[PDB]
Curated annotation (Swiss-Prot), chains A, B:
Catalyzes the oxidation of 5,10-methylenetetrahydrofolate to 5,10-methenyltetrahydrofolate and then the hydrolysis of 5,10-methenyltetrahydrofolate to 10-formyltetrahydrofolate. PANTHER family: C-1-TETRAHYDROFOLATE SYNTHASE, CYTOPLASMIC, C-1-TETRAHYDROFOLATE SYNTHASE, CYTOPLASMIC-RELATED. This is Bifunctional protein FolD. The lineage of its organism: Bacteria, Pseudomonadati, Bacteroidota, Bacteroidia, Bacteroidales. One of its GO terms (biological process) is tetrahydrofolate interconversion. It catalyses: (6R)-5,10-methylene-5,6,7,8-tetrahydrofolate + NADP(+) = (6R)-5,10-methenyltetrahydrofolate + NADPH; (6R)-5,10-methenyltetrahydrofolate + H2O = (6R)-10-formyltetrahydrofolate + H(+).
């Protein structure tokens, strides 16, 4: 009775759409888009994060670069690398894996990125452009959440969207996207966090819930109004990878719901790919 | 029984605090802070807006510059003016009066401003820094609203703040400030706009209401929960300058409420002055 917001499936169709644009570009004598990545240190997590973005470039048909520094690299050499990548016309977009070592000023490094190549959308100027409504790169995780809703023509105008979490990676940008005019958007937005005293009461008024707290089974059936659209952004490994939603009892109450895994995860990765294709064509979308 | 959020009064005390810092700086042999303004065309409104910022510089003891272009000025000469002001060490902050002529790219002009002198906080990089939580200039109107609450030690943690309006000048930045950790902040935020179908129902759950729709007597007593804090950002000339709040019946229900005039208006002007003082001392605050 409930419908899946099928991230694996939608991802697949976007990958196919990207290949078609690249194949077309190749036929008229052009080069494949190129995503460069900068890694510092040998953190195992960040290492898997980069590896995942390499595999994705393979599947969509992108060239990929990866530079690996030791974590004693100076701010000065890292900034020089950013400027080199900014100026390299063979690199359409690039990303700097975070976090960086304590002695490096992350803000300085990221703000040195040219916004036209900031396909992660991490540059504060792109964050600000998003809030204002100007063209710029939208970061991958909120971009893919909003695309999931656009792809299922989910009604959003006049709907109450309850965002659980005020994180920079998800809660704030998704709120800004769904506050824009038109659909998807024109939501009334309530943003909840650790100091919200009545989260259950708030969720019971939600037409759409964005669960991005990072707490397993935080969202239970007694918090969800029948017919709700539920987006599960949580990613916690438990004794299995689950989201923030107790799927077993929540999903039957929903009109639409993302599974974990197979929901937001694949949309995030493929949204990074889309930003890279846009960058290669000199666009922000 | 209700208390005023007295903008005239609080403004006065901040002006006095600014004079003391400038007097101190003068005693140790320094120059007064300098605010430069750029005006294009002879719009009567924008003309009064600039004049107001000139008078304010007088009262706090700032030097003021004003350049006046005709509205056929080219993008190229305006950009050259921005770069000159960026590079002029006698100018601590400067502002470009908006709107600009149709043939000028406002985004290009504003983004050419050095963020360190963007005392209006209009540069998308400062808008983005605000959302992320990084130092940067906060635009004057939300800055002064939040200062009004800080100055009266208004409890905000765990409180439901209902923002009426999703404007770039007020609704979005005030929402971002009051979503920050700590006080003032840690509010649960609901942002309402023209597509919100149940604004009265939403306002009846508000501990704090930011009324920034620009509609006279939009907020009535049947929408306000007893004890609410009401900030009236509206500025409409009617057959008298009023705000969005029907003060006569709403104010008796409030713990605290801003009058119009005498509320947000003076805080906005003096907040621009504070950003200029901060810029003169190489700060963003």
């Amino acid at each position: 009775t409930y419908k899946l917001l099928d991230g694996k499936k939608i991802s697949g169709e976007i990958k196919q759409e990207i290949a078609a644009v690249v194949n077309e570009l190749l036929e008229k004598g052009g080069r494949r888009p190129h995503l460069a990545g900068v890694l510092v240190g040998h953190d195992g997590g960040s290492e898997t994060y980069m590896a995942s973005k390499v595999k994705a470039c393979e599947e969509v048909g992108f060239t990929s670069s990866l530079i690996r520094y030791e974590d004693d690299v100076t701010e000065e050499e890292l900034l020089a690398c950013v400027h080199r990548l900014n100026q390299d016309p063979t690199v359409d977009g690039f990303i700097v894996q975070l976090p960086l070592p304590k002695h490096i000023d992350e803000q300085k490094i990221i703000e040195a990125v040219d916004p036209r190549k900031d396909v992660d959308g991490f540059h504060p100027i792109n964050v600000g452009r998003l809030s204002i409504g100007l063209p710029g790169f939208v970061s991958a995780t909120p971009k893919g959440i909003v695309e999931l809703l656009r792809r299922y023509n989910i009604p959003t105008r006049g709907k109450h969207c309850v965002v659980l979490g005020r994180s920079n990676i998800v809660g704030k940008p998704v709120s800004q996207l769904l506050l824009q005019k038109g659909e998807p958007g024109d939501c009334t937005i309530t943003i909840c966090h650790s100091r919200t005293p009545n989260i259950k009461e708030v969720c019971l008024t939600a037409d759409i819930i964005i669960a991005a707290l990072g707490q397993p089974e935080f969202l239970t059936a007694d918090m969800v109004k029948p017919g709700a659209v539920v987006v599960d952004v949580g990613t916690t490994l438990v004794p299995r990878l689950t989201g923030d939603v107790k799927f077993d009892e929540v999903a039957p109450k929903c009109s639409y719901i993302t599974p974990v895994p197979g929901g937001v995860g694949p949309m995030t990765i493929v949204s990074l790919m889309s930003n890279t294709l846009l960058a290669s064509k000199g666009l922000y979308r």
